[PDB]
Amino acid sequence: XXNXXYX
Amino acid sequence: XXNXXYX
Numbered sequence: 001x002x003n004x005x006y007x
Numbered sequence: 008x009x010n011x012x013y014x
C-alpha cells in the first residue's frame with residue numbers, strides 16, 4: 001500500500 | 008511500483 005486514493 | 012527506495 002502506502003499510496004492513498006480514493007478511487 | 009509500490010515499494011519505496013532510495014537506492
Ligand SMILES: *[C@@H]1O[C@H](CO)[C@@H](O)[C@H](O)[C@H]1O[C@H]1C[C@](C)(N)[C@H](O)[C@H](C)O1
Pocket residue numbers: 002003004
Ligand atoms: C514516492 O516517490 C515518488 C518517486 O518514485 C514520488 O514521485 C512521490 O511523491 C513519493 O510518494 C509520496 C506519497 C506516497 C506515495 N503516498 C507516500 O507517502 C510516499 C512515501 O511519499
Ligand SMILES: *[C@@H]1O[C@H](CO)[C@@H](O)[C@H](O)[C@H]1O[C@H]1C[C@](C)(N)[C@H](O)[C@H](C)O1
Pocket residue numbers: none
Ligand atoms: C488517509 O490518510 C490520511 C493521511 O495520513 C489521514 O488523514 C486519513 O485519516 C486517512 O484515512 C483513513 C480513513 C479511511 C479513508 N476511511 C481509511 O480508513 C484510511 C486507511 O485511513
Ligand SMILES: [Cl-]
Pocket residue numbers: 001002003
Ligand atoms: Cl498500506
Ligand SMILES: [Cl-]
Pocket residue numbers: 002
Ligand atoms: Cl507513507
Ligand SMILES: [Cl-]
Pocket residue numbers: 004005006007
Ligand atoms: Cl479507494
Ligand SMILES: [Cl-]
Pocket residue numbers: 011012013014
Ligand atoms: Cl531509488
